[PDB]
Amino acid sequence: YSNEQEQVLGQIVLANFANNEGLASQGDNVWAATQASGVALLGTAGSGNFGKLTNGALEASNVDLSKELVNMIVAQRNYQSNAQTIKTQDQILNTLVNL
Amino acid sequence: GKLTNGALEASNVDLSKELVNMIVAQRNYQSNAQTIKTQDQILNTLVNL
Amino acid sequence: GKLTNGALEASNVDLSKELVNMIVAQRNYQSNAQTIKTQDQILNTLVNL
Amino acid sequence: YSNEQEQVLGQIVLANFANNEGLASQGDNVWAATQASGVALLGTAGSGNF
Amino acid sequence: SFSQAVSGLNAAATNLDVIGNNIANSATYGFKSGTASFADMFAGSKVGLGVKVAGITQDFTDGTTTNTGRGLDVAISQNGFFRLVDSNGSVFYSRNGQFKLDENRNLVNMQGMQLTGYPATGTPPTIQQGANPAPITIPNTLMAAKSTTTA
Amino acid sequence: SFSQAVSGLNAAATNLDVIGNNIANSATYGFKSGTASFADMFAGSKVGLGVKVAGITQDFTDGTTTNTGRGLDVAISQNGFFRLVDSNGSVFYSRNGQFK
Amino acid sequence: SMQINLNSTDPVPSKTPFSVSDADSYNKKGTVTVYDSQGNAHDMNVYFVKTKDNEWAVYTHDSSDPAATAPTTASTTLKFNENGILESGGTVNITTGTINGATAATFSLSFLNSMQQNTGANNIVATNQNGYKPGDLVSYQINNDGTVVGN
Amino acid sequence: LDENRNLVNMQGMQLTGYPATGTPPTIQQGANPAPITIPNTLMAAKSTTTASMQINLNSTDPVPSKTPFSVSDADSYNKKGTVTVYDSQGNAHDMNVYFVKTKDNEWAVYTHDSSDPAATAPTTASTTLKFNENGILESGGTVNITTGTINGATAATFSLSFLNSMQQNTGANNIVATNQNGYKPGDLVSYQINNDGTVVGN
Amino acid sequence: SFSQAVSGLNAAATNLDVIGNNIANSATYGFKSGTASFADMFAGSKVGLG
Numbered sequence: 001y002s003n004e005q006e007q008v009l010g011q012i013v014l015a016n017f018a019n020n021e022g023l024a025s026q027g028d029n030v031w032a033a034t035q036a037s038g039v040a041l042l043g044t045a046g047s048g049n050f051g052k053l054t055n056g057a058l059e060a061s062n063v064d065l066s067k068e069l070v071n072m073i074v075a076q077r078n079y080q081s082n083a084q085t086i087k088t089q090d091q092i093l094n095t096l097v098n099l
Numbered sequence: 100g101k102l103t104n105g106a107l108e109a110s111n112v113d114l115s116k117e118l119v120n121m122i123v124a125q126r127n128y129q130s131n132a133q134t135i136k137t138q139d140q141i142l143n144t145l146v147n148l
Numbered sequence: 149g150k151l152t153n154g155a156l157e158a159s160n161v162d163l164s165k166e167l168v169n170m171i172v173a174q175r176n177y178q179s180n181a182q183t184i185k186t187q188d189q190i191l192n193t194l195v196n197l
Numbered sequence: 198y199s200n201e202q203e204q205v206l207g208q209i210v211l212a213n214f215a216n217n218e219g220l221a222s223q224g225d226n227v228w229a230a231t232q233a234s235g236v237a238l239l240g241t242a243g244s245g246n247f
Numbered sequence: 248s249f250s251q252a253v254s255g256l257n258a259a260a261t262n263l264d265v266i267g268n269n270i271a272n273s274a275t276y277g278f279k280s281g282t283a284s285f286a287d288m289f290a291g292s293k294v295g296l297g298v299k300v301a302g303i304t305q306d307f308t309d310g311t312t313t314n315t316g317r318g319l320d321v322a323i324s325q326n327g328f329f330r331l332v333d334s335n336g337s338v339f340y341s342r343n344g345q346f347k348l349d350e351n352r353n354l355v356n357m358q359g360m361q362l363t364g365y366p367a368t369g370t371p372p373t374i375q376q377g378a379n380p381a382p383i384t385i386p387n388t389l390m391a392a393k394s395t396t397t398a
Numbered sequence: 399s400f401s402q403a404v405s406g407l408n409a410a411a412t413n414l415d416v417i418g419n420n421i422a423n424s425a426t427y428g429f430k431s432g433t434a435s436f437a438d439m440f441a442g443s444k445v446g447l448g449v450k451v452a453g454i455t456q457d458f459t460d461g462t463t464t465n466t467g468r469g470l471d472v473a474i475s476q477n478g479f480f481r482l483v484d485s486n487g488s489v490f491y492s493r494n495g496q497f498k
Numbered sequence: 499s500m501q502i503n504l505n506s507t508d509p510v511p512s513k514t515p516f517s518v519s520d521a522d523s524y525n526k527k528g529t530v531t532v533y534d535s536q537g538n539a540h541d542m543n544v545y546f547v548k549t550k551d552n553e554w555a556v557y558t559h560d561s562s563d564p565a566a567t568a569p570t571t572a573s574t575t576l577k578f579n580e581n582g583i584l585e586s587g588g589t590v591n592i593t594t595g596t597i598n599g600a601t602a603a604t605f606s607l608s609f610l611n612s613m614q615q616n617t618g619a620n621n622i623v624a625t626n627q628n629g630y631k632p633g634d635l636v637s638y639q640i641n642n643d644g645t646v647v648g649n
Numbered sequence: 650l651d652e653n654r655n656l657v658n659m660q661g662m663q664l665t666g667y668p669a670t671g672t673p674p675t676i677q678q679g680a681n682p683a684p685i686t687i688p689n690t691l692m693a694a695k696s697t698t699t700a701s702m703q704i705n706l707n708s709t710d711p712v713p714s715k716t717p718f719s720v721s722d723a724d725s726y727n728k729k730g731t732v733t734v735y736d737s738q739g740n741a742h743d744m745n746v747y748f749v750k751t752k753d754n755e756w757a758v759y760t761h762d763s764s765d766p767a768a769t770a771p772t773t774a775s776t777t778l779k780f781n782e783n784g785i786l787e788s789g790g791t792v793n794i795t796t797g798t799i800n801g802a803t804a805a806t807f808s809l810s811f812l813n814s815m816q817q818n819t820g821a822n823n824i825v826a827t828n829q830n831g832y833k834p835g836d837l838v839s840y841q842i843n844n845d846g847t848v849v850g851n
Numbered sequence: 852s853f854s855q856a857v858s859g860l861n862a863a864a865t866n867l868d869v870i871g872n873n874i875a876n877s878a879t880y881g882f883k884s885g886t887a888s889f890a891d892m893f894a895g896s897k898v899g900l901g
Contacts (some may be wrong), residue, residue, distance in 0.1 A: 010383040011374045013366040014327035020307045025440035028358045029277040029343040038652035050323025051147045059322040061278035062310040063269050072266045076137045079259035085252040097114050100476025108473040110429040111461040117421040123853045127411040134267040134403040142175045245634050258710050268446035269404020275436040303444035311854035311900045358451035377528040383752040506738045506800045551801030580803040582738045615741035615834045
């Protein structure tokens with residue numbers, strides 16, 4: 001304030017879950033707690049089992065582009081292999097029908 | 100805030116940050132283009148069965 | 149709206165967004181042609197009975 | 198409006214059915230209510246089962 | 248007999264879609280990558296009926312912390328989730344720390360979801376670490392004065 | 399399928415347009431930088447339908463003050479906006495202090 | 499139910515008697531949201547005040563009732579043994595107030611599994627209650643074991 | 650890690666293994682495998698039952714000048730050390746151990762609890778460490794020590810050891826090792842699986 | 852990947868700006884010089900991001 005005095009308006013609460021993999025993503029970089037993830041355990045930053053908060057900073061995504069590209073290549077090759085299997089079954093069925 | 104006479108507030112655009120972000124963005128765009136290329140090859144493979 | 153003299157309103161066609169749609173529509177067209185070919189083979193195997 | 202004030206004209210209604218699969222398609226990306234689907238339940242977006 | 252080949256093609260398509268989605272959300276502060284988990288579906292016979300996707304598992308590893316600077320921006324380290332509420336009272340969780348004050352002076356993210364926390368009450372206000380979490384507000388009302396009682 | 403990659407390309411293009419607007423406006427008194435904020439589009443399935451541009455956020459950091467020697471030039475330090483009126487009486491707000 | 503952990507090193511508050519407005523008059527405050535017969539939310543505040551080592555007076559108040567009487571008598575007394583395990587006073591029957599004519603709810607509040615040892619500070623391990631508010635059907639599902647569940 | 654704190658695979662089948670029983674918990678391999686679970690159950694405190702203080706002593710130290718002993722006066726003793734023990738509630742008791750050289754190779758050690766404000770200062774020898782011809786500890790290496798009663802917690806009595814302590818021409822008296830088996834309550838911070846299959850919660 | 856080099860470049864730019872500001876105030880009565888303080892940004896992985 002302007003009177004050389006400050007006030008506290010609130011304290012941001014943090015949530016921790018037993019099962020992180022159980023949280024169902026609802027989009028808009030937002031998660032919703034469900035039965036598999038359990039009930040949310042609430043607390044404050046830096047106390048208990050919570051990490052502290054960094055001010056003036058944002059956490060970026062953990063997506064590495066190189067690994068994604070290589071996995072895309074491998075998955076494309078696997079998809080084409082499965083398509084080859086489908087073609088094989090097609091030729092087998094065509095051979096039997098042409099009998 | 101107070102007003103300073105005889106001067107202007109310049110832009111807050113730092114050029115080095117913009118250049119680095121441009122490099123990152125272009126690469127991301129190229130990665131997404133590669134994704135589209137992969138899915139295009141997938142659809143071609145399935146069609147040509 | 150306002151009128152700006154000495155200026156022209158360019159088109160609103162973005163080439164990137166278009167080329168991608170061209171690829172997608174090409175794939176849709178090829179899929180429909182594949183369906184046509186399938187029905188053609190259906191009629192063929194029925195006729196040759 | 199131009200008088201620095203906004204005015205509401207209406208609210209879009211949303212309809213949910215007990216049986217979506219029972220809806221009889223009429224074409225033109227349009228569905229029609231039938232006995233199999235049941236009577237449509239009306240409501241507002243973002244509330245209840247909407 | 249396409250029982251296996253069709254399932255394999257579907258699994259490969261799902262994995263490729265997951266990879267493409269990961270590629271697309273590369274610049275989404277608060278995004279965690281995903282990986283498809285596959286399982287076979289042997290059923291009675293030994294012929295290996297096919298494959299199925301057992302689920303999609305997130306990768307909840309902390310991303311790089313970038314000092315954008317905007318004061319409201321808060322990055323979270325280690326474990327924890329930011330808690331938000333929509334207009335209908337539902338509770339949601341997010342690692343994205345890009346916040347702004349709306350017209351009613353309520354801390355909201357880009358989508359308008361109200362950030363929650365322990366509110367303060369009393370004179371002087373004290374953080375009610377017990378009080379059920381409430382949306383955080385930053386009123387601009389003028390602050391009253393306290394008569395001198397201890398010096 | 400195609401939708402995820404299309405959304406990713408659109409988001410990358412929007413980011414690049416924001417960067418281009420910022421870099422072309424590096425020399426503009428009172429201009430504030432912009433940054434695109436992205437959000438994913440999960441809907442029911444866990445497949446991650448894609449990404450979308452949640453918005454473009456301005457950065458209202460006080461820029462460097464540059465003198466010019468003109469008596470009608472004034473800059474707003476810290477917070478504050480110049481209030482302006484057009485021909486129709488509509489109100490507007492700007493940080494640029496070049497007046498004539 | 500309210501499982502809490504209390505610190506054995508906390509000094510006895512100076513400001514006798516206990517006052518809800520006086521923060522210095524109590525050691526710890528917690529909140530539990532219960533629901534009455536009609537479905538109104540009662541934010542029951544539970545206050546822990548240390549009296550003598552191995553003794554904690556517990557007071558209760560209704561923060562949703564504007565006509566609730568100010569608590570002047572200790573609601574119960576938690577006594578922890580020399581090993582820090584709760585020995586007596588862990589259960590008490592508590593009745594809330596009346597809001598807009600709704601029937602007050604009488605429920606048993608249990609401090610089972612609460613322990614007093616040398617922790618960092620007073621922290622509430624867990625809170626739970628078996629009441630709820632009216633709910634509208636949102637979704638339905640069939641689980642792995644065949645049970646049909648409506649959320 | 651599911652909602653019930655068990656280790657399960659993607660399909661939900663629970664991983665099995667040898668459970669841990671006893672205090673301190675150890676893997677008992679004589680039992681049948683059981684599903685592995687990781688509870689948040691706070692860990693209780695352990696009052697100390699065994700403490701150890703290995704120290705090296707200087708031979709050239711002169712005897713204390715200001716007889717008698719006072720815990721307040723620094724010149725009244727040769728050395729002072731601190732060991733933190735824990736009672737039934739996990740409260741910290743700071744045992745100060747005082748070394749006064751009495752005769753050649755003979756060192757009286759006093760024990761005083763500084764965490765209890767109402768405890769009286771010791772006036773009589775708690776133990777007399779005897780060192781042989783060359784450091785080698787001779788006798789008096791183990792002493793029963795009783796804590797004070799603080800905040801209603803049970804006082805923890807324990808055996809405090811000076812084994813392998815030496816007294817030679819070392820430059821000065823400095824503590825080499827202090828150990829104790831007690832700990833204060835702690836909450837679950839992390840969990841890990843070792844390369845030998847053990848699941849360990851930190 | 853890119854974030855590490857981005858952080859390094861931003862730190863170097865901040866140091867350069869601080870040095871330039873100090874030089875610009877070479878003749879400024881009562882001015883005290885400034886120096887940037889740097890710290891690594893390890894987060895979980897042993898790579899040490901930035």
